Amino acid sequence: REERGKKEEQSRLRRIAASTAREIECFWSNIEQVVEIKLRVTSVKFNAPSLLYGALRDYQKIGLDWLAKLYRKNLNGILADEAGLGKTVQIIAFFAHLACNEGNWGPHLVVVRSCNILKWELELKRWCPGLKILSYIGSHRELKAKRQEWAEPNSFHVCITSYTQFFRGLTAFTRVRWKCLVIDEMQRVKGMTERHWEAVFTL
Amino acid sequence: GDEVGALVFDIGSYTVRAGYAGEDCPKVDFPTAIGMVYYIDTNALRVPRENMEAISPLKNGMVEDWDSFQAILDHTYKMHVKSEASLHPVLMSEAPWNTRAKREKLTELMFEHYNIPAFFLCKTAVLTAFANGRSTGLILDSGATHTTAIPVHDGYVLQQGIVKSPLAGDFITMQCRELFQEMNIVTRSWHNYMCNCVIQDFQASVLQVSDSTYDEQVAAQMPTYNCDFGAERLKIPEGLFDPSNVKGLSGNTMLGVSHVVTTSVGMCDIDIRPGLYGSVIVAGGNTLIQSFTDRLNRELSQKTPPSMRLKLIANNTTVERRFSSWIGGSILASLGTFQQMWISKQEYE
Amino acid sequence: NSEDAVMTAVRAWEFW
Amino acid sequence: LLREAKITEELNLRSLETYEADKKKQVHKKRKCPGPIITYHSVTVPLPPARCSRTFITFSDDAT
Amino acid sequence: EGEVTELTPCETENPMGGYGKTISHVIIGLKTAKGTKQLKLDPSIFESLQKERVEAGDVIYIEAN
Ligand SMILES: Nc1ncnc2c1ncn2[C@@H]1O[C@H](COP(=O)(O)OP(=O)(O)O)[C@@H](O)[C@H]1O
């Protein structure tokens, strides 16, 4: 009886401590859940699949192989394929291969329409996730805060910019060096009388 | 989410923390060493009055001089808390393993002199675990008087797996002394206190831990007179983890931080070691050393069984790790259990 | 695997 | 290095975008419990394979 | 049937779950005129015991099934 009473007192102390611990942990979990809810809401073909989580199709891989000559031979051409084949996935695989083969990453730029910014970053995060990407919103105040970690540090290797935003910050983008300048749906870049030509030329 | 306005105190060996509940930072912070001829404040550390003896209420992590404890508590309630100590609960932070007699004496003294309406105390490891937001884990505290690996399961210290090593305030207060003397150099107690203060400043300034076994390192300068110190600054911190690395000034055996953690985890019962290894928590003042957590992590990985996860808390970047106990104590008095599980005024009477 | 250890502990309790 | 850094960064971003739990709701139900909850629990235990049923009744606090 | 001497031998919490306080069996000390015989009945019946005024010293009419 004495030893059982001692053990029962020890167990009661243990259980009181455990109840207090459960209570504090539950309150901390509620706080963390609230915080998370507030925050959230003659053609050589040898490609490396490292960091390529998104499965690619046969014709997609073939197209990737045909375009390996550009980066290897320092050539530039137009990619005019019918919609539905995922040109964005091909460009993502190209960016991944540029690192899988050579150790150079560099800062990159991608011009996307205003109604396609979210779509492009979503696709980037889906296909071949591992990358550093940044968005461009709030040309007045928000961008000023984002442009405070670009000069010295390589905070991001790829950037998804918009057409209308370039013309208001040409003095800023022309300072930093870039390797790849992707522009999709060139239909808006078919009029010589537009000022976009001379704005994008000096890049 | 009820708040009554409780004052959470934490009698540390180097700095005492105190402040009203519901805050994310200790409002009160000053040296705990008491200078008796009887001044306890940064002023006491500064004022060069008549012969003064520098001592602290804590000794080996246990309150020995109750007079100094009463003095510091009164000084706090008078100047820092700036409020009468009779209409505010108190959440005392005892040592990792407090004794029956000590807790009884504390409760008696409180309920008699201060007449606190509600007084409760809990372990420090559980407070730190709650501050980090996890119930189960392994607290690795390294204070100014002791370092202990306290395995906690559901917010209760597993007294069977506790361990301790000689790593205390004597870390470099006398090693860095000779390290500096190698090149060149109110009572004796006050001189030793000032020496320890300047050595701690030198520590926070230049002391750094290496990523692997001791190796050559470039020199760095810092004022105190000015001098340039070579790899000497990277030598003493080596004794924290590996005893074989420090073969000249570490005796024949020494349980380093990694060895201490391994022993603490091994002494625990089965069915809980995976949770402990998965959630490892660090604490204390010595953890603020540069590249300390990095070496700890990259070394414990080697001394880790197979298929056992090792995910520590990446809070060392912030200086609040040393105050994790105070943060836990403060957030503790913002719950519903504060009214359910608590010691009222008429439980001991 | 966890359920295996749980049922093993239950069997140990039954034997006890 | 920077490679694993960007990998983990985009993995976290993907997790966040895909998070657009029942255990949390059970913990909330537990929170709402006054505390002195007695749980009737019976499970099948061994002696198809031979087995039997065992009954357990957990008491939260000593008051009950 | 017989004079009841209720007693619950404390048992470790459900081994399938966590820890705490549970009751795996409930022993009732039925005492009859011929002698005494303790019955280790199922714990789920504890509700019935508390339902009626079953205090130590009274005669209860138990049913097997
Ligand atoms: N008994 C103790 N238990 C736990 N932590 C302590 C104890 N005594 C002191 N500490 C903390 O450890 C720190 C030791 O200071 P120190 O490590 O010399 O400062 P730094 O290394 O940042 O220059 C103190 O700031 C104190 O808050």
Q: Are strands E22-23 and D51-59 parallel, antiparallel or unpaired?
A: antiparallel
Interchain CB distance below 8 Å, B332 and A24: yes
- In sequence order, what are the residues at sequence separation of 6 or more whose Cβ sits closer than 8 angstroms to the Cβ of residue B81? B7, B18, B28, B88
Find the helix or strand (DSSP H, E) in which D11 lies. Answer: helix D2-18
**How far C11 CA lies from chain D's nearest CA (Å)?**
7
Query: CA–CA separation, A94 vs A52, rounded Å?
Result: 11
Query: CA–CA separation, B227 vs E19, rounded Å?
Result: 60
CA geometry: angle at B336 spanning B332 and B341, to 5°? 75
φ/ψ of residue B43, rounded to 5: -55, -45
| Residues in chain A followed by a break, C to N above 2.5 angstroms | 41
Query: CA–CA separation, B142 vs B164, rounded Å?
Result: 10
The end-to-end CA distance of chain B, in Å, is: 29
Cβ-Cβ contacts under 8 Å, A19 against chain B: 337, 341
φ/ψ of residue B273, rounded to 5: -60, -40
Nearest alpha-carbon partner for A172 in A134, A146, A133 = A146
Query: Hey, which residues does B119 pair with through a beta bridge?
Result: B90
- Which token pair is B11? 């009698």
- Sign, CA dihedral B246-B249-B254-B258, equals negative
Query: CA–CA separation, A64 vs A45, rounded Å?
Result: 9
Instruction: Evaluate whether chains A and C are touching (3 or more beta carbon pairs less than 8 Å apart).
Output: no
**Ligand 1 binding pocket includes B322 (Cβ within 6 Å):** yes
- Sign, CA dihedral D14-D17-D21-D24, equals positive
What's at A87, amino acid-wise? K
3-state secondary structure of E59: strand
Q: E strands within chain E?
A: 2-3, 6-7, 22-23, 26-31, 36-41, 59-60
Cβ-Cβ contacts under 8 Å, D7 against chain A: 51, 129-130
Q: What is the DSSP letter of A189?
A: G
Nearest alpha-carbon partner for E30 in E11, E51, E58 = E58
What's at B172, amino acid-wise? I
Query: CA–CA separation, B291 vs B207, rounded Å?
Result: 10
Burial class (CB in 10 A: 0-12, 13-18, 19+), B133: middle
Q: What is the DSSP letter of E56?
A: T
Q: 10 Å Cβ neighbour count for C11?
A: 14
Residue D17 in contact with residue D11, Cβ under 8 Å?
no
Residue A131 in contact with residue D6, Cβ under 8 Å?
yes
- Sign, CA dihedral B264-B267-B272-B274, equals positive
What's at B198, amino acid-wise? V
* Alpha helix ranges (H) inside chain E: 46-51
Own/partner pairs for E8-15, CB < 8 Å, 24+ apart?
Answer: E8/E46, E10/A4, E10/A8, E12/C13, E13/D58, E14/D41, E14/D43, E14/D56, E14/D58, E15/C6, E15/C9, E15/C10, E15/C12, E15/C13
Query: CA–CA separation, D56 vs D44, rounded Å?
Result: 11
Query: CA–CA separation, B22 vs B8, rounded Å?
Result: 10
**Ligand 1 binding pocket includes B200 (Cβ within 6 Å):** yes
Query: CA–CA separation, B326 vs B122, rounded Å?
Result: 12
Query: CA–CA separation, A135 vs B122, rounded Å?
Result: 48
Nearest alpha-carbon partner for B97 in B29, B163, B183 = B163
Q: Are strands B119-122 and B147-152 parallel, antiparallel or unpaired?
A: unpaired
Q: Are strands B28-31 and B34-36 parallel, antiparallel or unpaired?
A: unpaired
Query: CA–CA separation, B176 vs B179, rounded Å?
Result: 5
Resolution (Å) of this entry? 3.2
Burial class (CB in 10 A: 0-12, 13-18, 19+), A95: buried
**How far D50 CA lies from chain C's nearest CA (Å)?**
13
Which residue has the CA at smallest separation from atom 3 of ligand 1?
B143
Find the helix or strand (DSSP H, E) in which D39 lies. Answer: strand D38-46
Nearest alpha-carbon partner for B135 in B152, B151, B159 = B152
- In sequence order, what are the residues at sequence separation of 6 or more whose Cβ sits closer than 8 angstroms to the Cβ of residue B177? B195, B199
Residue B207 in contact with residue B198, Cβ under 8 Å?
no
Burial class (CB in 10 A: 0-12, 13-18, 19+), E46: middle
- Sign, CA dihedral B249-B259-B133-D10, equals positive
Burial class (CB in 10 A: 0-12, 13-18, 19+), A98: middle
Nearest alpha-carbon partner for B332 in B11, B22, B107, B105 = B22
Residue B313 in contact with residue B132, Cβ under 8 Å?
yes
Cβ-Cβ contacts under 8 Å, D37 against chain E: none
Query: CA–CA separation, E26 vs A172, rounded Å?
Result: 81
**How far D12 CA lies from chain A's nearest CA (Å)?**
10
Query: CA–CA separation, D33 vs B340, rounded Å?
Result: 13
A14 contacts chain E (CB < 8 A): yes
Give me the residue from E13, E17, E43 closest to D55, CB to CB. Answer: E43
Query: CA–CA separation, B153 vs B143, rounded Å?
Result: 22
Residue B177 in contact with residue B194, Cβ under 8 Å?
no
Sheet of strand B28-31: strand arrangement: B28-31, B15-20, B7-10, B90-93, B119-122
**Ligand 1 binding pocket includes B141 (Cβ within 6 Å):** yes
- Sign, CA dihedral A138-A144-A145-A147, equals positive
Query: CA–CA separation, B279 vs B310, rounded Å?
Result: 7
CA geometry: angle at E24 spanning E18 and E28, to 5°? 155
Using the atom order of ligand 1, give the atom closest to the CA of residue B145: 1
Residue A59 in contact with residue A85, Cβ under 8 Å?
yes
Nearest alpha-carbon partner for B151 in B297, B277, B303, B299 = B277
Q: Are strands B7-10 and B90-93 parallel, antiparallel or unpaired?
A: parallel
Q: Are strands B137-142 and B147-152 parallel, antiparallel or unpaired?
A: antiparallel
3-state secondary structure of A139: coil
- Which token pair is B341? 């599980």
- Which token pair is B165? 């090593």
The three-state (H, E, C) secondary structure of chain B, written as one string? CCCCCCEEEECCCCEEEEEECCCCCCCEEEECCEEECCECCHHHHHCCCCCCEEECCEECCEECCHHHHHHHHHHHHHHHCCCCCCCCCEEEECCCCCCHHHHHHHHHHHHHHHCCCCEEEECHHHHHHHHHCCCCEEEEEECCCCEEEEEECCCCECHHHCCCECCCCCCCCCHHHHHHHCCCCCCHHHHHHHHHHHHHHHHHHHCECCCCCCCCCCCEEEECCEEEECHHHHCHHHHHCCCCCCCCCCCCCCCCHHHHHHHHHHCCCCCCHHHHHHEEEEEECHHHCECHHHHHHHHHCCCCCCCCCCEECCCCCCHHHHHHHHHHHHHHCCCCHHHHCCCCCCCCC
Q: What is the DSSP letter of A176?
A: S
- Which token pair is E33? 């005129």
**Ligand 1 binding pocket includes B288 (Cβ within 6 Å):** yes
φ/ψ of residue E15, rounded to 5: -65, -20
3-state secondary structure of D38: strand
Query: CA–CA separation, A60 vs A63, rounded Å?
Result: 5
Query: CA–CA separation, B151 vs B162, rounded Å?
Result: 7
